[PDB]
Amino acid sequence: RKYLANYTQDPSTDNFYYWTCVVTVAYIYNLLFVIARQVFNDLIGPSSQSLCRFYNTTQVECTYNMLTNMKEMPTYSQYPDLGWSKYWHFRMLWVFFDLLMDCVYLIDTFLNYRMGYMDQGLVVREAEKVTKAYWQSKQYRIDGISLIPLDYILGWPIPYINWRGLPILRLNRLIRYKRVRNCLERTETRSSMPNAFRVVVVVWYIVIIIHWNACLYFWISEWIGLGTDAWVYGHLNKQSLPDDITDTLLRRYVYSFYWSTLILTTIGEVPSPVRNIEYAFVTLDLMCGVLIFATIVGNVGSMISNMSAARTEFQNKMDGIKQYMELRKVSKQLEIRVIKWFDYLWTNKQSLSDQQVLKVLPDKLQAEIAMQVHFETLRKVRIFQDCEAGLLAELVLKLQLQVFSPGDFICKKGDIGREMYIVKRGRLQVVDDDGKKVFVTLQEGSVFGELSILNIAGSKNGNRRTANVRSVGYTDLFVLSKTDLWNALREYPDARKLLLAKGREILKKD
Amino acid sequence: RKYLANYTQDPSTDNFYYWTCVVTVAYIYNLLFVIARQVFNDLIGPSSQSLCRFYNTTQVECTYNMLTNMKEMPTYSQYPDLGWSKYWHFRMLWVFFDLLMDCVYLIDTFLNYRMGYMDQGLVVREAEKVTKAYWQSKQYRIDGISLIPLDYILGWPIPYINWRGLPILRLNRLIRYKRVRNCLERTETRSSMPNAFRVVVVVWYIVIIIHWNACLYFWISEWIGLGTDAWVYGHLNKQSLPDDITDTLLRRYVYSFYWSTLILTTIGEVPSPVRNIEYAFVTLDLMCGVLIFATIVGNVGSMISNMSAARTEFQNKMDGIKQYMELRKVSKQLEIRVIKWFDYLWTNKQSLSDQQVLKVLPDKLQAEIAMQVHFETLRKVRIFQDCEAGLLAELVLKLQLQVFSPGDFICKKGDIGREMYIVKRGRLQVVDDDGKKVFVTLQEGSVFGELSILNIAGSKNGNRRTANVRSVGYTDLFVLSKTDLWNALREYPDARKLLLAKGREILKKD
Amino acid sequence: RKYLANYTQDPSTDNFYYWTCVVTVAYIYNLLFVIARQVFNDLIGPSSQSLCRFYNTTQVECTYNMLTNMKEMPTYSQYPDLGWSKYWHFRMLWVFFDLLMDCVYLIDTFLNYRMGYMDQGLVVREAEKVTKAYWQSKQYRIDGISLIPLDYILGWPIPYINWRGLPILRLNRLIRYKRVRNCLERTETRSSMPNAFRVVVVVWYIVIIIHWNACLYFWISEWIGLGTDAWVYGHLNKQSLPDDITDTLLRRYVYSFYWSTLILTTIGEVPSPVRNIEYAFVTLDLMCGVLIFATIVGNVGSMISNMSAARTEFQNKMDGIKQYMELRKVSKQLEIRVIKWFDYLWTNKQSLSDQQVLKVLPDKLQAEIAMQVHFETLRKVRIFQDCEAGLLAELVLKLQLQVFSPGDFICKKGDIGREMYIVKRGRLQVVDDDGKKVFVTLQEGSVFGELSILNIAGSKNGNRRTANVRSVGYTDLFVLSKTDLWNALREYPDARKLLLAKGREILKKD
Amino acid sequence: RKYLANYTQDPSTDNFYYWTCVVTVAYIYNLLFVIARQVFNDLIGPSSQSLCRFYNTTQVECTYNMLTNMKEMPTYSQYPDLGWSKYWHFRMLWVFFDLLMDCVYLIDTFLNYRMGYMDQGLVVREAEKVTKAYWQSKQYRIDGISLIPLDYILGWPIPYINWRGLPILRLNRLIRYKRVRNCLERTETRSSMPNAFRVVVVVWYIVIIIHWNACLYFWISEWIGLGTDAWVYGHLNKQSLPDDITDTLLRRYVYSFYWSTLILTTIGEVPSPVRNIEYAFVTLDLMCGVLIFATIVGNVGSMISNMSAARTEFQNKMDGIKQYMELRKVSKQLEIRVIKWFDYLWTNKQSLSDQQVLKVLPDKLQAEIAMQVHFETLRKVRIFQDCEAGLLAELVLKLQLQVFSPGDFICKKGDIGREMYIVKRGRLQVVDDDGKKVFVTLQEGSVFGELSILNIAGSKNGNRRTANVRSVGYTDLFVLSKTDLWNALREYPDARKLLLAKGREILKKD
Ligand code: NA
Ligand code: NA
Ligand code: NA
């Protein structure tokens, strides 16, 4: 057991993220149930009995039929010992759970004690060094000590004598929120489908908000006499107690939740304020809503917005194009051909310009990603395989995928060669004179367009396309600009030797 | 008929898009009418009779005057055989239509069997290969089999004995939605006016949404006793049955549709909830609305937004300009002149920078588009026509249209020549000394500004404008930077020969 | 008068814009008053008398006290001749005005006949050519003929016998809207304060929209029996006729306008629908509103948004900066100094990067604008004034204004000279050794930093700052990069001669 | 005291900003309390007594129990001398405060007299020059004189005879608003947390707006007979005076504030208009709200939006990345590694590209900022410390921080050297053959990658990495591209001498 005294925690383990998730469950526990325990003291308990009165006029106890359709509100008369004698299982449950959550807080604090802080990229896991880092950071001990007084035990509804119980004291536990943030932040970055999680979270915000606010309605409604006017919960406003509904805990939470729902989303179909104090409230609360919920739902909207912003960008680009063609009265054949290009461009979803990977990432990560992705396709290329050098490691960074429509000339005889293409998919044939030539077909992995780039003129043609290469269907090519090939080629003269060695043999035929 | 056994379907035909459109009509059929058939069982049928009671106190049948202004809700008493004996035409109709839709589903599945998948840009239309692709893709047979059990026939209101009918089983047909998406996606990209279609679609979403939700109101309202409180449809809430209105199917759908309209757009002018279960509902539904419709209508807004975003961008640029001139106290003549420039720039709508075509498209498509568009205008140019080479094919990519105000010097004597202009429209005159010179007028298609770019100095003037060219009205010029002309000119020395051959003859006069 | 037969109109005159503005007033006339004349036939007229009945039970005429607090709606009993005998001034007014508006339409059509269309930048003002252009464009005669049948005269409430009058026929005049657009488009581009006008316009849209819709409420309310239920205007719904209010035209338009206001902005505090037909309406209308007004007010918001987007961009940039400095724990002195830089940068509003003028405008317009603006400041510069060449015309395009904080070294001894500064405002002193040197002060218009750029080394110092120049307050400098000065300097060797001629004389001292 | 006659004020002192803040408090004073004093004349006073009547039917005075549950509104009967005899403390208070605020206005005007205007970057503090600048600017004396007539004293409720008092005259003070703007503008630019202040301000706007509007409701409600219908405040609409609430000033302001809250945020749960005039009002006011508040709350939303737009941008970039990796089916190991890179990138918040500082700021400020920040880190570098020249001053502008994942090769043997790295944090070891070499570890401040950049080949290796450098954890490097190092190195040949002097000694080992 002595090993668990000098034990140090690494912040960067998956297990720890599981733990932070646990702290999170404890947190939500408190901020959901504590306040509600404070307001609806009917919950743990009750700590008193109903004393409803029926003529035929003695005060009686509570009968589930006499808590319906009441003339006046039921007087709350307190027990001799309020509590545990009548209700035992319940209170014991709540103590087990609170005790549990608090255990989570404690264990979390022990881990905070041994948190392997990070000195220059490495995790420092040490005996006295870590604890040193703890107490040198005064904030750790300050907030950390603040939420574990366990003052709630003394504020709980126990004792039986002279104390109602202030469960609201548990609110001090709410100051550990930083841990919870560090959880959610790290959960988005894990989730396969982020915007899913990211929307679920926000729905929870709304529900807790609405919750607390409901509790506020009910508390304020307790503070003012409950059943003394048409705005405070109770028989006086017929909205909450229609005649045939029976009074309960469930009802109160239900109606209060409904009330808060409306006021916070400004439908406002709620019985109107009757005391200056209430106007104070309802206005505060209505304004609070027109700002709070404005922003909130203007974020849910933005979230479901940026979700499929790819598609939005796309339809933008395209509509631009089509507009341009309608106004300038281009042919029908050409316009059709274009829109077919876009269609196939988007039904393959290879349309991703990858400028994401380019810009945001470190250069090295671009190399390994593109490596894996195009790995098999390049694996069947003469040029990259032949050179011992990982020159490929250079060129991968700068290859751009271009899609060509079917039956269309990639190349024409007697044209300037600037690019050199490597086929990712589709098959294309070398032809001259609109057929009857040697239809030579290159499949994926093949290399062409290289004769012009390499400045060799055995037949004296020059930077001219020797043949004209045609596509048979929708073909995707890697495009490597002359400048890049050459700027990279000085570094590896062997590749020069091999590529030129092939080039002499291709120009030999001519 | 054996030819229709080995028949294979091409995904890329116009006819197929017509077909997918048909599948679409079947889909909408189901998701509109199925659920409603489930809820309003009054529709197919009814399967029972009304049994309203009037004193003077025997239970009677239904009279269209006694279904108005009722004291209590009508008891539904079931037929001996519920159904087809009394109503025949109707049920037969619904069976013909369901059977029809199902035929569409079946034919669609046979086409799915023979779907010519695309291997490397070409469509593979083959006997066993295609079917191989079907069953290798386990998802095809999984979802495809799932929606055609035809289980509805066994769940339909038939039999007469012991079965009410669960039309809701037909819901399994809803899982073919992917086909419908592939339709809409392909319809936007076809439509001449996209944003039209794109708005119509969204209006349909809203209506189906509102629809289902209405059905939900009515179902939930059936499940709770119908006419037992002030929130469930029926005589109890005077909103739906005002005294003089008669009860009907039409009414129910109408009121329920209205109700859903309000709750989903949070006007919420609707009789308030009376049972805890209903609060549960209405809150669920209100929140559901404040998110669902928030986003939806925040998209209709965005759609009508980006529609004419051209114009918005424009007014932005301009307001910037005008602001700049007011603050810096520029003259009145100059400011007027500018705003006239913008006016004519926007009344011709040739203001499109075409950077759409530039950026989004493949380079080759830019060439053919601009080819067709400027085709006639360039068709009357000496330089492009004279050279046998399709050098034009190079330059078309890099020509920028510049608009010049009337009476203003394009060129002045003794200035650096950097550009070379080709006139798209307007006419402009060569003049020296503010008139009395040889007013030489070039119309569209003409070429000038070329003497300075070509580094020839027979009179030793240099990269200097020989004359000063003036515009007579609003003239549009093609602008070709020196660097481009030259970088392109090395490739075709013949064009050099001809252009210089003209240049010597123009400088000969001087 | 024969001169007014062959008279041709120029589209590009200020007078014409005044005219289009007039056509606009006629347009608004029609789309505001026509529909209302159609609905509230009380307006022109009435064409009948009230026939209210009071017991003590004969039908009587209308008394302004008996049209209040009514038991039942007043029966409309028609005149023997309905109209002009009782009311004369009014109807004559409406005919004078309609006739007037129609005159505007006619004159507009004669101008359309003679509209000088624009052939290649110049306005073609000709006898038969213009008319040729009219009838060759079939649309001109089609829409143009369509709105002037004058069919209204035959549909007016006259005749006395057998005709009620269909003023709604005048709706055909609404098809000239294109002219009105061409007005507003041209008014924004004129207005000194655009966003003012641009907001006023939109407020008019809202009001006309709300208007028509009100008329719709009232029409539909006429079509259904007026005063037969709690949703149609009239004594039945106590919202419109509270007991003490008297019935009038004014009331109807007022209440209907209010009603439409609510339904179109979904407050919806309006008596609820009572007939299936009405639900049809109100839903149609509510949805119509949640889309129409969503967009509309989401545009008013966007308008008041982009208005002062300068300021928004600014606060963005700055908050970024301050954030950066807080996190990285920079000093206090430095941070203060920065924020003072921004303050003075924004209190002078010379902060405009002018990239508006740069990007959007033609290159020539940038030259003349900047010419005028900096005209006086440059007018007092040795270098620009001395050279006969308008070389300035080159450099003006590429000068960037840089603001420097007070007391801070623009230059330090022994540093690389890359830029050359010209002072726009402030005064700065040449000093060495933190004072006690020759404090030489350059005011605006002065030129310095030029010794290093010009590659002259008589003392062999090189591209080194000879002295160190210090600012006394907030000084604004023109900045001209070495590359620009030089690239421009090859073109004018005289400027070289003069600048170097000064340079030898400044380096002479050393 | 004569020194305070020729005393001139500097606009650019902290004290002055304190003063403007004071003027601000006076301003808010007026625009909050003046209008309310005008409307609720109950406030200062009252100037009359209540005269409520109770049968058992003589008119009596006011009793706080008889101002509850009234049958009819209380008649206001005026005093013989209305005012100061009965209420003294109050009125004296208001006069002291108004007089105070006015003193602020006066002192502000004296400061305006002596405002040191800024001529060419320097503050001109002079005797007659400043006053000259005052009166030459006619606007100063125009608006400045306009708000200090002190006309309020003559409009105050005094005199006792024949005057009710028009406090509203004080409105003329509202025209000094420019000063207040110049305060707020300068407060944002000071505040550490801007968006805090920026939101608080907007909440004040809303409250003042709502305020005035409330006053408007109440004024209009006074103008119409108060307690004559169900829309004007008073016993007639049971919303404001429910039976048990007593009538007061407090109530009026409360209810009116509530009313305005609803109408301006279109909840609109308010008793409906009863006179044509009121419809006029409420519609005006409702429309006014649907525009005013639309924009306002669409700004609070935008404010809380751009607040943490860093984080939004980040999640955008990342989600892009993860999407890309899911679709293209990259490995699990690589994907994990990436997301860990992002995690550590964002948990250090050193992720700021600093392009803010780059773009927005002057070049010199970038130098000093980065100087301070990286000061200690660079303070321990051989290269920068050794060279006497402040060459560092050059390179600081162009160093980019790159983060590398742990255990990953920064360098590999036999690769092109393009960059040269300086370690900001982390430690990394030089190793060959996957261990067993000389593990040489560089800590922060160290310099490497320099051998390849400097074109020296004593062993003939060339621009090749001699060793392969590996990281042990998450290491941050300064990256200096070859082009930059060299372009900067020509300027200081000494640095060349030293760096090469080290290079020979490192290549000596090999
Ligand atoms: Na509402
Ligand atoms: Na409402
Ligand atoms: Na609302």
D398: buried, middle or exposed (CB in 10 Å: 19+, 13-18, 0-12)? middle
C-beta atoms surrounding B44 within 10 Å:
20
Element (H, E) at A259: helix A249-265
Distances (CA, A) of B351 to A316, B356, B476: 18, 12, 11
Tell me if D487 sits within 8 A of D382, measured CB to CB.
no
**Alpha-carbon gap, residue C272 to C283, rounded angstroms:** 11
Rounded to a whole number of angstroms, the distance from the CA of C310 to the nearest CA of chain B is: 9
Tokens standing for D479?
């990256």
> Among partner residues D322, D334, D406, which is closest to A368 by beta-carbon distance?
D334
> Closest by alpha carbon to A72, among A56, A86, A59?
A59
Query: How far D209 CA sits from the closest chain C CA (Å)?
Result: 17
**Do C148 and C103 touch, CB atoms closer than 8 A?**
no
Instruction: Calculate the CA B275 to chain-centre distance.
Output: 44
Is B470 annotated for ligand binding?
Answer: no
Phi, psi values for residue C166, rounded to 5°: -115, 70
d(CA C378, CA C390): 13
Q: Do C266 and B267 touch (CB under 8 A)?
A: yes
Q: Reduced to 3 states, what is the DSSP secondary structure of residue B59?
A: strand
Dihedral Cα A388, A392, A394, A399, nearest 10 deg: 160
Name, in order, each residue with C-beta under 8 angstroms of D485's C-beta and a sequence gap of 6 or more: D395, D420, D453
Cα distance from N-terminal residue to C-terminal residue, chain A: 85
CB C475 within 8 A of CB C425: yes
Q: For residues B119 and B132, give the distance between their C-alpha atoms in angstroms, rounded to a whole number.
A: 13
Neighbours of C505 (CB within 10 A): 9
Q: Say how far apart CA A327 and CA C172 lie, in whole Å.
A: 29
- Note whether A352 and A476 are within 8 A (CB): no
How far are the Cα atoms of A471, D158, D282 from residue C262, in angstroms, in the given order?
Answer: 62, 45, 11
How far is it, in rounded angstroms, from Cα D344 to Cα D196? 29
Burial of A255 (0-12, 13-18, 19+ CB in 10 A): buried
Q: How far apart are CA A118 and CA D425, in angstroms?
A: 11
Q: Is the peptide bond before A46 cis (omega within 30 degrees of 0)?
A: yes
Q: Which two tokens stand for residue A240?
A: 């909450």
Record the tokens describing residue C354, joined without a space: 């002018």
What's phi and psi for D165, nearest 5 deg? 105, 125
Q: How far apart are CA A158 and CA A160, in angstroms?
A: 5
Report the structure determination method.
cryo-EM
Tell me the CA distances in angstroms from A248 to A62, A207, A253, A254, A270, one per residue in order: 11, 22, 9, 10, 20
Contact C256, C211 (CB under 8 A): no
Q: How many CB atoms lie within 10 A of CB B179?
A: 17
Residue in chain A closest to B228 (alpha carbons) equals A244
Three-class secondary structure of residue C476 per DSSP: strand
Other CB atoms within 10 A of residue B235 CB = 17
Distance CA D375, CA C435 (A): 29
C428-431 sheet: strands from edge to edge:
C440-442, C428-431, C468-471
Show the tokens assigned to A152: 């709630």
Sequence-ordered list of residues with C-beta below 8 angstroms from that of C375, at least 6 positions apart, any chain = none
Which H or E run includes B400?
A: strand B400-404
Distance CA A158, CA B251 (A): 59
* Contact present, B479 and B433 (Cβ < 8 Å): no
**Token output for C439:** 């404090």
* B274 interfaces chain A, CB cutoff of 8 Å: yes
Residue D40, CA atoms < 13 Å, CB-side half-sphere: 22
DSSP D99: H
What angle is formed at CA C82 by the lines to CA C76 and CA C88, rounded to 5 degrees?
120
Element (H, E) at A183: helix A177-188
Task: Output the CA A267–ligand 3 centroid distance in Å.
Answer: 5
Instruction: Check residue A143 and report its DSSP letter.
Output: H
Which residue intervals of D348-455 are DSSP H helices?
Answer: 355-360, 363-379, 382-386, 392-395, 450-453
Which residue do the tokens 């599945």 mark? B109
DSSP string, A403-429: EE-TT-BS--SS-B--EEEEEEES-EE
The tokens for A158 are: 């126990």
**Terminal C-alpha separation, chain D:** 85
Neighbouring C-beta atoms of residue B336, cutoff 10 Å = 11
What is the greatest pairwise CA distance in chain A? Answer: 123
For chain D, the C-alpha Rg in angstroms (whole number) is 37
CB C456 within 8 A of CB C500: yes
Q: Do C269 and B265 touch (CB under 8 A)?
A: no
Q: How far is CA C361 from CA B50, B335, C184, C354, C468, in A?
A: 78, 12, 23, 11, 39
Find out whether the peptide bond into D46 is cis, omega within 30 degrees of 0. Answer: yes
CB contact under 8 A, C362 and B404: yes
Cα–Cα dist A284/C65, whole Å? 46
Any CB–CB contact under 8 A between D304 and chain C? Answer: no
Residues 6+ positions from A16 with CB-CB distance below 8 Å:
A9, A10
Give the helix/strand (H/E) hosting B251.
helix B249-265
- Euclidean distance between CA atoms B140 and B108, whole angstroms: 12
What does the buried/exposed string (b/e) look like for D407-426 if buried means 16 or more CB atoms within 10 Å of the residue's CB?
eebbbeeebbbebbbbbbbb
- Which subunits have 3 or more CB–CB pairs within 8 Å of chain C? B, D
Q: C149 — phi, psi (to 5°)?
A: -65, -30
Of C356, C397, C401, C492, which to mutate for an interface test with B (greatest number of B Cβ within 10 Å)?
C356
Q: What is the DSSP letter of C403?
A: E
For B123, the enclosing helix (H) or strand (E) is strand B122-123
Q: Between β-strands A428-431 and D475-481, what pairing exists: parallel, antiparallel or unpaired?
A: unpaired
Residue C121, chain B, CB below 8 Å: the answer is yes
For A65, how many CA atoms within 13 A lie in the half-sphere containing its CB?
1
Residue of B nearest to C228 (CA): B244
A328–B373: do the CB atoms touch at under 8 Å?
A: yes
Strand-pairing partners, residue B23, are none
> E strand or H helix at A49, and its extent?
strand A48-49
Alpha helices, DSSP H only, in C224-275? 249-265
Task: Centre a 10 Å sphere on the Cβ of residue A110 and count the other Cβ atoms it contains.
Answer: 11
Cα distances from B462 to residues B415, B452, B466, C394, D505, in angstroms, run 10, 7, 9, 17, 55
Q: How many CA atoms lie within 13 A of A391 on its CB side?
A: 20
| C358 vs B: CB within 8 A | no
**Hey, what amino acid is at D307?**
M
What is the Cα A426 distance to its own chain's centre? 38
Instruction: Please tell me if residue A85 touches chain B, with a CB cutoff of 8 Å.
Output: no
Q: Is B465 annotated as a binding residue?
A: yes
State residue C208 phi and psi, 5-degree precision. -70, -40
Q: Please report where in the chains the tokens 């859903």 appear, as a residue.
A: B260
* Rounded alpha-carbon distances, angstroms, from residue A335 to A307, A326, A341, B196, B357: 30, 9, 10, 20, 12
Nearest-Cα distance to chain C for D158, in Å, is 40
- The answer to whether the bond into C362 is cis (omega within 30° of 0) is no
Q: What is the C-alpha to C-alpha distance for residues A265 and B289, in angstroms, rounded to an integer?
A: 11
Token digits of residue C401: 């204004």
Q: What number of other Cβ atoms are within 10 A of residue D481's Cβ?
A: 15
Tell me if B231 sits within 8 A of B217, measured CB to CB: no
Distance CA(A65)–CA(A50), nearest Å, equals 13
- Partner residue opposite B266 with nearest CB, options A267, A316, A427: A267
CB-based contact C509:C440 (threshold 8 Å): no
- Whether residue C35 contacts residue C214, with contact meaning beta carbons closer than 8 Å, is answered with no
Alpha-carbon torsion C458, C464, C467, C471, what sign?
positive
**In Å, how far from its chain's centre is CA B223?**
41
Alpha-carbon separation of residue D83 from D90, D97, D156, D158, D462 (angstroms): 10, 18, 11, 8, 100
Nominal resolution (angstroms): 3.5
Handedness of CA A417, A418, A422, A427 (dihedral sign): negative
Rg of the Cα trace of chain A?
Answer: 37
**Residue listed under structure tokens 């893709």:** B137
CA C428 centroid distance within chain: 44
Phi/psi for B347 (5° steps) reads -80, -10
Rg of chain B, C-alpha, whole Å: 37
Secondary structure of residue D440 in the 3-state scheme: strand
Residue at token pair 């929606």: B147
Residues closing a segment before a gap in chain C (C–N exceeding 2.5 Å): 56
**CA nearest to C432, candidates C408, C451, C459, C413:** C413
Q: Which of helix, strand or coil describes residue B287?
A: helix
Burial class (CB in 10 A: 0-12, 13-18, 19+), D397: middle
Q: What sections of C307-436 are H helices per DSSP?
A: 309-327, 332-347, 355-360, 363-379, 382-386, 392-395
Question: By C-alpha distance, which of B47, B25, B148 is closest to B97?
Answer: B25
Instruction: Provide the β-strand partners of residue D470.
Output: D409, D429
- Residue pair D393/D370 in contact (Cβ under 8 Å)? The answer is no
Spatial separation of the C-alpha atoms in residues D364 and C477, rounded to whole Å:
14
Q: Using CA atoms, how far apart are residues A169 and A147, in angstroms rounded to an integer? A: 10
Q: Which residues make Cβ contacts (< 8 Å) with residue D440, sequence separation at least 6?
A: D429, D430
The answer to whether A427 and A461 are in contact (CB under 8 A) is: no
Distance CA C232, CA C223 (A): 10
Single-letter code of the amino acid located at C347: T
Instruction: Count other Cβ atoms within 10 Å, centred on residue A322.
Output: 20
* Chain B residues in contact with A298 (beta carbon < 8 A): 294
**CA separation, residue C391 to residues C373, C386, C489 (Å):** 17, 11, 9
D283 touches chain C (CB under 8 A): yes
Beta-carbon contacts of C378 under 8 Å, excluding residues fewer than 6 positions away, are: C384, C392, C422, C445
